Amino acid sequence: NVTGLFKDCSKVITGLHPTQAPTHLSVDTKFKTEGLCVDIPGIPKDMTYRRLISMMGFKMNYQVNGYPNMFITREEAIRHVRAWIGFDVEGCHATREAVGTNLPLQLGFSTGVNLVAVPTGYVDTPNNTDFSRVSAKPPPGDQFKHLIPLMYKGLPWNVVRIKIVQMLSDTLKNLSDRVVFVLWAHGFELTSMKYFVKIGPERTCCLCDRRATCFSTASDTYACWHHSIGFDYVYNPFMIDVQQWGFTGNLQSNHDLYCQVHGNAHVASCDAIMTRCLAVHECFVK
Amino acid sequence: AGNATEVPANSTVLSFCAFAVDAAKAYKDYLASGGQPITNCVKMLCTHTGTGQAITVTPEANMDQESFGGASCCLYCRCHIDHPNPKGFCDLKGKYVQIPTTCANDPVGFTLKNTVCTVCGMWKGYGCSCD
Numbered sequence: 182n183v184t185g186l187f188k189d190c191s192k193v194i195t196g197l198h199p200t201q202a203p204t205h206l207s208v209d210t211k212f213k214t215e216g217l218c219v220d221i222p223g224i225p226k227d228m229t230y231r232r233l234i235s236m237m238g239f240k241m242n243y244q245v246n247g248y249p250n251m252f253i254t255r256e257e258a259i260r261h262v263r264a265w266i267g268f269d270v271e272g273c274h275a276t277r278e279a280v281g282t283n284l285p286l287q288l289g290f291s292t293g294v295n296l297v298a299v300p301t302g303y304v305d306t307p308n309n310t311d312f313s314r315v316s317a318k319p320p321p322g323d324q325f326k327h328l329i330p331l332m333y334k335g336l337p338w339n340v341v342r343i344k345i346v347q348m349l350s351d352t353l354k355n356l357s358d359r360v361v362f363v364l365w366a367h368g369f370e371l372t373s374m375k376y377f378v379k380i381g382p383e384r385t386c387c388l389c390d391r392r393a394t395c396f397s398t399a400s401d402t403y404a405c406w407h408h409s410i411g412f413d414y415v416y417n418p419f420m421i422d423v424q425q426w427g428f429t430g431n432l433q434s435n436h437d438l439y440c441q442v443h444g445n446a447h448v449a450s451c452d453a454i455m456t457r458c459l460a461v462h463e464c465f466v467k
Numbered sequence: 468a469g470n471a472t473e474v475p476a477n478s479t480v481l482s483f484c485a486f487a488v489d490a491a492k493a494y495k496d497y498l499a500s501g502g503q504p505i506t507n508c509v510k511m512l513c514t515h516t517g518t519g520q521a522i523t524v525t526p527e528a529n530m531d532q533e534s535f536g537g538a539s540c541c542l543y544c545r546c547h548i549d550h551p552n553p554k555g556f557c558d559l560k561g562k563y564v565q566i567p568t569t570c571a572n573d574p575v576g577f578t579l580k581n582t583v584c585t586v587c588g589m590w591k592g593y594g595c596s597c598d
């Protein structure tokens with residue numbers, strides 16, 4: 182039994198040296214014997230590798246005292262409808278030095294904003310994990326053609342995450358003490374949140390009594406939506422996957438049952454607007 | 468395409484720690500709320516006649532220890548997150564780490580909680596000959 186979380190997407194045929202492999206599975210077969218591993222004199226460590234590690238497959242089903250749930254029930258989401266922000270991400274695929282994982286390319290929100298990121302991944306090396314630009318291409322197909330020019334219009338993730346925090350703060354500071362990302366088929370949205378979300382126990386802002394919604398790696402401080410200028414991470418967001426409410430077909434077919442004003446313009450922000458709109462019609466209309 | 472590195476028993480804990488502001492505190496809290504320690508580490512077969520030093524080039528477990536591959540006992544390596552070292556580099560990856568047998572059920576938690584003496588090379592409280 183294995184998971185795809187942290188799958189090694191490199192094209193290297195062999196596994197790793199026992200001192201460098203993060204796990205027993207990742208150790209090369211040559212070192213495995215008698216249920217464990219052995220050091221083999223004369224077989225050296227690899228001092229130049231770059232192995233892309235997949236961030237697909239997170240499971241946020243922990244229950245730890247003092248840490249809030251990220252995924253919330255439909256009833257809780259309804260009470261916080263003012264905090265709803267639809268969110269969708271269009272990805273690009275790892276290619277060349279790696280294959281088998283999706284990287285965020287166009288991040289779209291129900292505010293109508295689309296942010297484009299440089300294709301970036303988590304590359305294990307002999308010394309650390311290097312969060313860095315990786316070779317990528319849009320998926321093939323006429324439905325993904327619009328992503329082609331975006332491959333060269335991306336911003337570095339350190340800039341994209343500041344822009345996400347600023348956009349959420351401007352939109353929500355007078356509406357809610359939190360954010361609820363409204364999702365449809367959440368897997369890749371949760372993988373994308375690894376790039377701009379941090380979690381921990383519930384905290385208060387550095388300048389007031391409000392709960393903290395943002396975190397700054399510059400000072401290791403917390404802020405609410407009013408005091409987050411310059412902050413780079415979204416802290417303790419909430420989320421709900423609308424697809425889990427009993428729908429059968431795709432997003433657009435279900436959205437179109439209640440709504441006609443949101444035509445599909447085929448872009449992350451449009452999918453984010455359709456997702457929030459469908460959730461609003463399902464929970465509050467008629 | 469690709470090759471799996473992990474098992475489903477570690478999905479929850481690694482996901483929780485991969486998103487945390489403070490991964491070490493998240494791991495400690497996950498254990499205190501009844502979670503299982505991270506498994507699938509690189510445990511070595513050795514002769515248990517080693518020096519007993521904490522961090523070594525080859526396995527050096529004495530009779531009170533087990534030897535593991537260094538990266539596999541490092542929470543930051545396991546979660547593929549930043550290391551809290553000044554230049555962000557790891558001190559365990561590329562070495563073997565000796566863990567007291569009484570603590571070998573949770574090597575990651577052991578390395579998070581403990582410190583190596585720079586004078587004698589052994590773990591403080593688990594072999595250090597200085598104090």
Ligand SMILES: NC(=O)c1c[nH]c2ccccc12
Nearest residue numbers: 189194195196206207470471
């Ligand atoms: N064939 C194999 O099992 C593998 C080859 N390279 C790897 C890297 C990580 C995990 C497993 C492997």
Ligand SMILES: [Mg+2]
Nearest residue numbers: 365366367370
């Ligand atoms: Mg989706």
Ligand SMILES: [Mg+2]
Nearest residue numbers: 269270449452
């Ligand atoms: Mg989409």
Ligand SMILES: [Zn+2]
Nearest residue numbers: 386389405408
């Ligand atoms: Zn505040």
Ligand SMILES: [Zn+2]
Nearest residue numbers: 440443455458
């Ligand atoms: Zn609509």
Ligand SMILES: [Zn+2]
Nearest residue numbers: 541543544557
């Ligand atoms: Zn490490």
Ligand SMILES: [Zn+2]
Nearest residue numbers: 584587595597
């Ligand atoms: Zn000492």
